[PDB]
Design a protein around this nucleic acid. Structure first.
Lengths: 191, 104, 227, 141, 68, 141
RNA sequence: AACGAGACUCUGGCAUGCUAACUAGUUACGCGACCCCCGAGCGGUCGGCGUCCCCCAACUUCUUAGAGGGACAAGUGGCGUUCAGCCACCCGAGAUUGAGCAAUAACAGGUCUGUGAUGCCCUUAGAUGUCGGGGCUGCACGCGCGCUACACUGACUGGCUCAGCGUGUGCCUACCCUACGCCGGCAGGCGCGGGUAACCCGUUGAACCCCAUUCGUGAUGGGGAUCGGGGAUUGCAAUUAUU
């Protein structure tokens, strides 16, 4: 605590990665815990450089999309502070363990791609990197809250905290755990 | 009497400018006129951004031209006679000079 | 007699005077081997150094022509009377003076002479006078009513980078005939690298060479030599 | 005897000259408290060195900072970058090596441009685009 | 990346080592200042290159014989 | 305390109330028909907007060297949505600010001083810093 | 051996080193003045807040612009014929920050409506060379470049708070940028003053953003097309609506 930042109130201790596969691309607490998610603007100039930056920051980055929200990273952080707050009142946990489950449960195990034969569509099943899983899982759940709040009275904060619950405990009421299983259902067929 | 006399230089060529300033600072300090150094002012950009094609046709292209002026001024305080004597002579290049009666 | 215009506008108006004159003169001194000017304002006096190769034809008998030229400028730009003072100058080394070489080729051609032998004759002169190399173009008609181009080239040339501003000069002159117009262009490369005037800078242009002196001797053996 | 050493920080043309002058506590910026510098959501960030190093490093100085340039954001990184270096310079000049070498290891661990500066500034636009890379649409019919 | 040395460097680098073999060290900075005095290289960036290749050659010349 | 120390969102909301108690500010008749700037599309919701804006007027004079009716408007101006045309900045009303500053001057909390601008009276400067501590007395700074 | 490539020029990134500054600042007091006890103390003083005062003060970190230095695959570990080079790492600004310049030969490409550049042909007093009026904006339709939108990650109304490249009357023939005072809801009017410009406008007190109200999933207060009436400014003249 006096030598390692919390989050402004939320411990990064008592936080685990419960896979051996997806750690070393999920990290949040080795020393990478900080008061806020922000950077000086170094995040990528090498392929390995992407991995290092926190998961909580990565979530904030992929939250601002679709034209009108680009370049408004401070507005974005407002939504994240409410998210953890709502998650803690609503279920009562270290609200980061919610998010870590939500990411790990939403990442695909097998994926398909295209292959050109006879000028006609054929598909091939292939595997997926841990770095791919994390990138995909962060994409998918953020699309859910963006979609729901497009005509609902509910705010995006409320929508997003709901979306991490249904991902963290699979229940197929989320946009993520649905879309995960769609890909794998294809990957079984053409293989 | 001893009047604060300002020798303004103005040019477009950094070599031609600077060496003529140096000459006047040597000749002044040689005679102990209590000369004050150059005050280099911000170099100003004339920009002209215009078509490269007369009678526009083909891929749209332009051309940046620029002129850089330079100003700098040395402040002396000494009798106006010996200044106006020595100043106007010993200038080789096309570089302008403007003498002022007083400013301070 | 005042005040005085902005410093920004001060340079523009000087440029307009430098340029207008330089095309005024070229339409009168073309036959006298014009090669440029160099203006200088001096204390309470204007100097206009009218560079041409043959000062003879510029001067005239009793200095008539120089008197015409001074009276023109005294009225045209509205100069204060008697401030204007002309001077002439002869240039030495005439084959580095592309402007004059091009405009001489013009009157050789317009005099009525073949193109190939004329281009060769001007070429070896500008090569002989000193020059790394040189080039001539003639674009326009000849031997029918479709156009062609005729390049005559010898020596070195450059085309790229910042050295183009220093180490070459280039001129363009239109010449008329009874059938259309012919374009002359002359491009000539300056040779100085050892020293002087100094005019163009001492390093080599396109491949920038390493100037290399040599010394290397030893005969040393131990001894003490008192001084 | 008067002790005064000055430093600055930069990020994207936002200068912040933070003088460390002998005294006790009371860090300010523009003659205002750092507690109220105004986005007040990034409040944990400019506070970060002071909070992490402890307030007992800031017990022999009065620091005041003057700023200029940049936007609301880039100023925050500038004032942080200056106060970090300001503290260091005070130890570099009046105290021994092993005091400040320790402090250097702590800050540079979570380096975030506290003791270094980005070289990144805007690139110059060229014609045929509204941006430096982005281009106007191209039609074939 | 890239930055493969041109022939203008490799031509003069060989020459400068042949006639000033004694003056050479194996440090960058010392071999720079020697090239500055025994010749003039008209650029600054060019000078920083020719020194570095002169250094890189002098490493190999202290082994078996070079064929250039 | 100096007015620098405290929050400024709190400052105005106690200073506006202060004035309206004391019978201060003789207001213009037009105050219920007034768009308030050229770039607005509506009147304010507030029914005591005049009291609120006089607060913000006197504060800025404490900080900066003081300036006239023109400069006050430039500080307040914002963005103008021109509909189908792209938005641009523009300045708001003048004749409101010309009533504000003359109403303050009637109380002698400001006065036309030298160097092209009204400046705030020492009596005015007394009253600002007097209620500045009242803010800290209230909540707890 | 030569041209192009590279080299080169400009620009960005590294200087508490060098050079020097009331048309640039900082610091230091001398301060005296204002302010509140706001903290120790009492209000003074010490400390805090800016402004005037500042010098015959001190300095050049910040700002300005000049001379210089620095980066070379330099060092280390792999890899390569162990050559030319390539990959990782230390130091750190990593060997690519972005532009300018650019060969041979060609095109029946564009331009006679840039040219007092130009051939030939035509026309030249009932003129293809001058004043007045109209048109290039005329629409059942087809296509291209864009702008503004379809909302709650929002709109609306208040409050807070940050910037840079430039430009400006004394020019073309009649014309600039604007502070300040006064009058008007606004457009605007009117009285005075400065600026040849690191000097005056402008310590460019800009937007998104930030903070607090109001609206509530509704073609809604989202959207602002279409259209009626009225008020100003430019000009010799504003109708087919100049703004």
């Amino acid at each position: 605590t006096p030598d390692i930042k919390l989050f402004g109130k939320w411990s990064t201790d008592d936080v685990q990665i419960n896979d051996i596969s997806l750690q070393d691309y999920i990290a949040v607490k080795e020393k990478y815990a900080k008061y806020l998610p922000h950077s000086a603007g170094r995040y990528a100039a090498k392929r390995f450089r992407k991995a290092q930056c926190p998961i909580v920051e990565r979530l904030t980055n992929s939250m601002m999309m679709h034209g009108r929200n680009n370049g408004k990273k401070l507005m974005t952080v407002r939504i994240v502070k409410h998210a953890f707050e709502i998650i803690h009142l609503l279920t009562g946990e270290n609200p980061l363990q919610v998010l870590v489950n939500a990411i790990i449960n939403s990442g695909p195990r097998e994926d398909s791609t295209r292959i050109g034969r006879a000028g006609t569509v054929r598909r091939q099943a292939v595997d997926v990197s841990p770095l791919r899983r994390v990138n995909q899982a962060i994409w998918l759940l953020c699309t859910g809250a963006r979609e729901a709040a497009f005509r609902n009275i509910k705010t995006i904060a409320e929508c997003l905290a709901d979306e991490l619950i249904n991902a963290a405990k699979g229940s197929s009421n989320s946009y993520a755990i649905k879309k995960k299983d769609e890909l794998e259902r294809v990957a079984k067929s053409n293989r | 009497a001893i009047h604060r006399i300002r020798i303004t230089l103005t040019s477009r060529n950094v070599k031609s400018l600077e060496k003529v300033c140096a000459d006047l600072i040597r000749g002044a300090k040689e005679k102990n006129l209590k000369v004050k150094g150059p005050v280099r002012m911000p170099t100003k950009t004339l920009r002209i951004t215009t078509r490269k094609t007369p009678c526009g046709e083909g891929s749209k292209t332009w051309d940046r031209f620029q002129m850089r002026i330079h100003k700098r001024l040395i402040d002396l305080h000494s009798p106006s006679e010996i200044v106006k004597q020595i100043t106007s002579i010993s200038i080789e290049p096309g570089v302008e000079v403007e003498v002022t009666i007083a400013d301070a | 007699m005042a005040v005085q215009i902005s410093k920004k506008r001060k340079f523009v108006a000087d440029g307009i005077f430098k340029a207008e004159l330089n095309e005024f003169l070229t339409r009168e001194l073309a036959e006298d081997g014009y090669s440029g000017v160099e203006v200088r304002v001096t204390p309470t006096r204007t100097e206009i150094i009218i560079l041409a190769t043959r000062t003879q034809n510029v001067l005239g008998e009793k200095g008539r022509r120089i008197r015409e030229l001074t009276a023109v400028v005294q009225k045209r730009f509205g100069f204060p009377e008697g401030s204007v003072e002309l001077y002439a100058e002869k240039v030495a080394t005439r084959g580095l003076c592309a402007i004059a070489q091009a405009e001489s080729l013009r009157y050789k051609l317009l005099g009525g002479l073949a193109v190939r032998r004329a281009c060769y004759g001007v070429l070896r002169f500008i090569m002989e006078s000193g020059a790394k190399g040189c080039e001539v173009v003639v674009s326009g008609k000849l031997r029918g009513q479709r156009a062609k181009s005729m390049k005559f080239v010898d020596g070195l040339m450059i085309h790229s980078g910042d050295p183009v501003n220093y180490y070459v000069d280039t001129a363009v002159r239109h010449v008329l005939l009874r059938q259309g117009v012919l374009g002359i262009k002359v491009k000539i490369m300056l040779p100085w690298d050892p020293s002087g005037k100094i005019g163009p800078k001492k390093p080599l242009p396109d491949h920038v060479s390493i100037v290399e002196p040599k010394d290397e001797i030893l005969p040393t053996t131990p001894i003490s030599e008192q001084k | 005897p008067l002790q005064s050493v000055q430093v600055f920080g930069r990020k994207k043309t936002a200068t912040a000259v933070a003088h460390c002058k002998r005294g006790n506590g009371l860090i300010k910026v523009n003659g205002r408290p750092l507690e109220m510098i105004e986005p007040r959501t990034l409040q944990y960030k400019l506070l970060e060195p002071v909070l992490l190093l402890g307030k007992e490093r800031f017990a022999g100085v009065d620091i005041r900072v003057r700023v200029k340039g940049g936007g609301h954001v880039a100023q925050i990184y500038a004032i942080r970058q200056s106060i970090s270096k300001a503290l260091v310079a005070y130890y570099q000049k009046y105290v021994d090596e092993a005091s400040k070498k320790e402090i250097k290891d702590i800050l540079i661990q979570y380096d975030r441009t506290l003791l270094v500066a980005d070289p990144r500034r805007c690139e110059s636009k060229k014609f045929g685009g509204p941006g430096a890379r982005a281009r106007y649409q191209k039609s074939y019919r | 990346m890239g930055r493969v040395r041109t022939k203008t460097v490799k031509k003069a680098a060989r020459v400068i080592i042949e006639k000033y073999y004694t003056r050479l060290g194996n440090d960058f900075h010392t071999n720079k200042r020697v090239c500055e005095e025994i010749a003039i290289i008209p650029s600054k960036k060019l000078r920083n290159k020719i020194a570095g290749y002169v250094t890189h050659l002098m490493k190999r010349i202290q082994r078996g014989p070079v064929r250039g | 305390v100096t007015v620098k120390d405290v929050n400024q969102q709190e400052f105005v909301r106690a200073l506006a109330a202060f004035l309206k108690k004391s019978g201060k500010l003789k207001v213009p008749e037009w105050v219920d028909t007034v768009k308030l700037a050229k770039h607005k599309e509506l009147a304010p919701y507030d029914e005591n907007w005049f009291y609120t804006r006089a607060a913000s007027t006197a504060r800025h004079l404490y900080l900066r060297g003081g300036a006239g009716v023109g400069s006050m408007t430039k500080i307040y101006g914002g963005r103008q949505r021109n509909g189908v045309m792209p938005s641009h900045f523009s300045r708001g009303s003048k004749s409101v600010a010309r009533r504000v500053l003359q109403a303050l001057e009637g109380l002698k909390m400001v006065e036309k001083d030298q160097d092209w601008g009204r400046k705030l009276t020492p009596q005015g400067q007394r009253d600002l810093d007097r209620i500045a501590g009242q803010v800290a007395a209230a909540k707890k700074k």
